[PDB]
Amino acid sequence: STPKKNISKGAVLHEKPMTVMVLTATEPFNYKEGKENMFHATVATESKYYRVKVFNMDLKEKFTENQFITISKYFNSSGILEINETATVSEAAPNQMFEVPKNIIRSAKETLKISKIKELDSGTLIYGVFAVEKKKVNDKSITFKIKDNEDNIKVVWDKEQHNINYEKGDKLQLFSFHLRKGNGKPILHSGNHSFIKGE
Amino acid sequence: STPKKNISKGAVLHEKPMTVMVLTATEPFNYKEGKENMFHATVATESKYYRVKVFNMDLKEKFTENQFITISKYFNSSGILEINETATVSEAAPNQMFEVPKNIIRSAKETLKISKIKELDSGTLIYGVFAVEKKKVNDKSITFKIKDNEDNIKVVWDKEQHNINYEKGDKLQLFSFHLRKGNGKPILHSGNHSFIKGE
DNA sequence: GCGATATCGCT
DNA sequence: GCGATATCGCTG
DNA sequence: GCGATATCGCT
DNA sequence: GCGATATCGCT
DNA sequence: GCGATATCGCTG
DNA sequence: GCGATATCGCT
């Protein structure tokens, strides 16, 4: 539809094919409100793991746990792969397949300590699974609090009301949330691509 | 709506107010088919006369024979004033009014000889009043021929079917037509802003 | 077999 | 085909 | 856009 | 008297 | 506010 | 866009 369409500001295009194994992917959902579906994915190589944002819905079938794929003309914004109709995505050839270390996989399912998160620069993109607290409904928002035990952080959802909690004691899983500090006590804020659900 | 909106490629913006008397103006009509009304006007100063294209319909009332106006932030493309919502157009102050020579006025109602027209570079914009010949209807066009007596030139209308002829022996008046030469015998071709009517 | 249209190139 | 003009997307 | 040449199409 | 929203600046 | 990306408008 | 501060508004 357009070369950089749906791509983040300043993302760098990556030329050469890279082959990865899919760990994880979410349902497509909706943003830029009402237009623009996308979905979230985690993939790995032998060396490292990447978080992915997928703007071309045709790719949804290629993204399934443990499936190997080859990507080219994708975009990297600050370490997060972004992918749209401009990229080519193939089912990988066996010769291109490889082993993926337990470490890497452990490492890519792993969630930071709220303590450690708070030492991070403003605007940092946060992902993780968290225990939850009392929510709220506000004319135009929703409010959480989540526990690492050793915190303690508030979470602000600015988007819209659909999803599933989940009868509270269900835990809470976060994609692409924005760290905000300022003068106040810091919080995690919803963003373009933000996604929450029960784990 | 947009600074250069409806303005011709490479038109230069004119900063300082200029004061002119309206000789002539046409009804608004329609182009870029179905969108984009505009209208044609002839105006003069003491020194010279200009052909004008007016894309802001609010200006229609300001343009009436013999009325003096002040224009600023208008555009000149190859000697043809172009005017849109970006320009300012005021009813002129009497101190700004002036005399307009018979010569200039004669000169701006005046039509070239088809002979002399044909020595002109391709793509030149032609205006004039002309005697007419047998027409045609073609699936997607209309064809004329017009006489200066000493020519002899064909005319091609690519636009659409509304206007008034006029029971042939009515004469024919042309705004902003394109001279086309090439290998063939030359012709006058309809364009974006082209307009024909009976005089 | 001519004129009316469609394609090219870049304007 | 390609530069000019308008809209999009939010550092270091 | 638009002008020029290349092709279409009635007959 | 706090949190939820609206505005600013430029990102 | 402003540079980057996409669409607009057709020399010399 | 988005983060930060400035203002709104229930009570």
Curated annotation (Swiss-Prot), chains A, B:
Changing residue 145 to A: Strongly reduces affinity for DNA. Changing residue 192 to A: Does not affect DNA-binding. Strongly reduces affinity for DNA. GO terms for biological process: activation of innate immune response; cellular response to interferon-beta; inflammatory response; innate immune response; negative regulation of AIM2 inflammasome complex assembly; negative regulation of innate immune response; protein homooligomerization; protein homotetramerization. Keywords: Cytoplasm, DNA-binding, Immunity, Inflammatory response, Innate immunity, Nucleus, Phosphoprotein, Repeat. Changing residue 106 to E: Does not affect DNA-binding. Homomultimer; homotetramerizes (via HIN-200 domain 2), enhancing affinity for double-stranded DNA (dsDNA). Interacts (via HIN-200 domain 2) with AIM2 (via HIN-200 domain); preventing activation of the AIM2 inflammasome. Binds to several transcription factors, including NF-kappa-B p50 (NFKB1) and p65 (RELA), FOS, JUN, E2F1, E2F4, MYOD1 and myogenin. Also binds TP53/p53, the hypophosphorylated, growth-inhibitory form of the retinoblastoma protein and the p53-binding protein 1 (TP53BP1). DNA-binding protein involved in innate immune response and has anti-inflammatory activity. Inhibits caspase activation in response to cytosolic DNA by preventing activation of the AIM2 inflammasome, probably by sequestering cytoplasmic DNA and preventing its being bound by AIM2. Also inhibits activation of the AIM2 inflammasome via a direct interaction with AIM2, which prevents the interaction between AIM2 and PYCARD and formation of the AIM2 inflammasome. Binds double-stranded DNA (dsDNA) in the cytosol. This is Interferon-activable protein 202. It comes from Mus musculus. The lineage of its organism: Eukaryota, Metazoa, Chordata, Craniata, Vertebrata.
